[PDB]
């Protein structure tokens, strides 16, 4: 009854494709966007799924010349004689309805989001079962999305899990700091990461213009004089901000911030961004936290007189990620991977000591959102069908 | 006489270091800057080039309990004792006049542009030469970046130097096409790129969030029957619009549309985004252009209203491209590589036969303009050095 034609007409100067479904409602198609999503041969390159169809070719003024119509199909008509036939629930799917748009969007883009702190329980999965089933997997990545963290257990105490993993997405996103990375103290470290200190709350890879979206992290080596973990959902953090102090919230949303990373890893960088520490898409809602104390720069290019409100800002943000009912803490056992959103978390590290023997050791690696949403699209199918 | 200390004093209440130079000139400090920004082992990790100083620990009320200078160096000491040395040519850099800051800024991001119509003379080097010299590496990423586009000539008619260019920068882009990948036509073809028709002018990969900052093309086989290459300065041609149709414009730099890939190549792949066709800064400086009309989503999700003024404004930008004034056309010979800037330029092809032998053949890849400015960087020290 929804996705069935009761009655389609060309309306508004034959400007417009009017649609009634036997459930009664109307769906309305711009005729200029009909023909620009003809999908003859001629118009479609069904092989690729994408439009051959130039601009240079679709008339914007166009209008339909005849339409007829069965139950599940119109049939059109156009100006110049080309011929297009679209198929009911094709239509249907696309209806430019704020509702059908919506529920579309959510589709494709996953947004359900289930904020946290201090109660978080730890999303948990099996690593092997992860990498065997799609139900799993499809579980790992849709409650990565949701969550911002799954850890899963289980993996070896060997290096090439967490490639394993790449794998299973489908790869890597590979930086200066190679395609996986060691974490452990080392002489001349190139990097804090790569010592015995504390890493307070921070994002990876700020110095980069487009920050790694999803970190992996699997314990190979634990001390037990420290060297536990804590994560903070700065979406979360970020919300309470703008309650607590607009005003600081404002400034670390509209501050541009220099990062810097200058060294030799996988191969000799000096690398240099900006970003505002809390970004914000043009509806105002936040889409990225950009903060890794480390690599601010020394260099930071603001009027003077921006300067001491900046940092009185930042204490005020890095204090309510510090409050106990924003902060979860855990220790990685070795066999343990965290997998986590590192443009919405935050996450750090407890100093332990240093001795002659490497005590602790984590092997990391990035991988890009548009890589993981692809992969989660694609589970979801084959586990729906 | 512009790096030399003539006096270093406390003042507002000791919040601030003013340096009065020996020219003169004056420059003022925050001392919580200065304080976020001591040097010591303490402080700073000298191997990483990083702060270990703590948000924390730093208090955004500090004052400078006392100060001592000499002509090369600032002396001081905090409220808690912690005690800091400054030099001057590092302070000096650092200035925050607005003469200082953007002198810094221009030297970190080579923001100098040369924007050009049909009029281009395409800047041309030897491939060898800048895989072997320096000097010819510098003087082609500084023209990549200032220009959007350099040929270099040549190179081999054989896969592989592409990979070697990659290697020059420091490692290429990695999508779901591949490391590299093979422009050529295919049968089943999974982008209309691998056929042998037209390419109108776009850029690559909006279907990703993160479109491919540099892309790299090697003719290894050309056809006579066609398949000659055009670019446009797509911020040439954004400044041209905004100017002879504002409404267009606006509508295109503010209008949110749909792009996706799905298909199967390097892996299995279902990709989805959202851009602004012309994506402005927050200054309202056009910084990157997402089109591409293949891949240009049938699911476009704005209200039924705007739908067609967002084709009227699309064709008005297209036929703007398409004008003479604005386009540069020419043909690759087979060992012809050209690397441009796939965030400013759009680019296309002309079609050309189908046969039963292959009579055409690109090797294409990316590279993350991150990557690129590091490289620019380091070269610039090595060739001034
Ligand atoms: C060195 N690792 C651990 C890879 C982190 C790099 C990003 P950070 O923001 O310096
Ligand atoms: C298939 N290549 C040539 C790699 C282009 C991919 C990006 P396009 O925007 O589809
Ligand atoms: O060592 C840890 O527990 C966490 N490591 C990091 O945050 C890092 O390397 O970026
Ligand atoms: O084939 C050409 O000349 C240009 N190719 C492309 O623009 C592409 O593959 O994206
Ligand atoms: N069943 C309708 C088929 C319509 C074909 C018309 C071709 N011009
Ligand atoms: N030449 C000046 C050295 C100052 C050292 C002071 C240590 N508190
Ligand atoms: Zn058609
Ligand atoms: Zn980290
Ligand atoms: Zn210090
Ligand atoms: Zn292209």
Redesign the interface.
């Known amino acids: 009854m929804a996705c069935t034609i009761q009655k389609a007409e060309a309306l508004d100067g034959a400007?417009?494709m009017q649609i009634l479904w036997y459930d009664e409602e109307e769906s309305?198609?711009?005729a200029?966007?009909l023909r620009?999503?003809c999908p003859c041969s001629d118009c479609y390159?069904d092989?690729?799924?994408?439009?051959?169809?130039?601009?240079?070719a679709?008339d914007?003024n166009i209008g339909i010349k005849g339409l007829i119509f069965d139950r599940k199909k119109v049939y059109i008509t156009w100006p110049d004689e080309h011929y297009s036939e679209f198929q009911a629930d094709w239509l249907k799917k696309?209806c430019?309805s704020?509702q059908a748009?919506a529920k579309?969007?959510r589709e494709?883009?996953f947004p359900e989001c289930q904020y946290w702190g201090s109660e978080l329980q730890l999303p948990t999965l099996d690593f092997e079962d992860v990498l065997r089933y799609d139900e799993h997997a499809y579980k790992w990545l849709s409650t990565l999305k949701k969550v911002g963290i799954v850890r899963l257990t289980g993996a070896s105490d060997k290096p090439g899990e967490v490639s394993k993993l790449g794998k299973r997405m489908?790869?890597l996103y590979?930086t200066?700091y190679g395609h996986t990375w060691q974490v452990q103290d080392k002489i001349?470290?190139?990097?804090?990461a790569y010592?015995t200190?504390?890493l307070?709350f921070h994002t990876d890879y700020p110095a980069?213009?487009?920050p790694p979206g999803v970190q992996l992290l699997h314990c190979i080596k634990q001390t037990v004089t420290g060297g536990d973990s804590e994560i903070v959902d700065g979406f979360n953090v970020c919300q309470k901000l703008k309650k607590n102090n607009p005003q600081a919230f404002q400034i670390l949303s509209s501050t541009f911030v220099?990062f810097?990373?200058?060294?030799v890893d996988?191969?000799?960088?000096?690398?240099?961004?900006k970003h505002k520490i809390i970004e914000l898409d043009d509806k105002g809602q936040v889409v990225r936290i950009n903060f890794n104390?480390?690599?601010?720069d020394?260099?930071?290019?603001?009027?003077?007189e921006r300067?001491?409100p900046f940092?009185?800002a930042?204490?005020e943000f890095?204090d309510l990620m510090?409050s106990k009912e924003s902060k979860f803490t855990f220790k990685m056992n070795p066999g343990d991977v965290i997998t986590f959103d590192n443009w919405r978390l935050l996450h750090g590290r407890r100093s332990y000591e240093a001795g002659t023997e490497i005590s602790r050791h984590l092997e990391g690696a990035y991988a890009?959102?548009?890589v993981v949403?692809?992969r989660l699209?694609?589970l979801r199918?084959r586990v729906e069908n």
């Open positions: 400007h417009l309305l198609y711009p200029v966007w620009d999503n390159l092989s690729a799924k994408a439009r051959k169809l130039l601009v240079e679709l914007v696309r430019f704020k748009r579309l969007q494709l883009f489908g790869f590979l200066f001349d470290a190139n990097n804090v010592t200190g504390k307070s980069l213009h487009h220099d810097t990373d200058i060294g996988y191969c000799d960088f000096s690398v240099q961004s104390n480390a690599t601010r020394t260099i930071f290019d603001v009027p003077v300067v001491q940092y009185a930042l204490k890095v510090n890009d959102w548009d949403m692809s699209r694609i199918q």
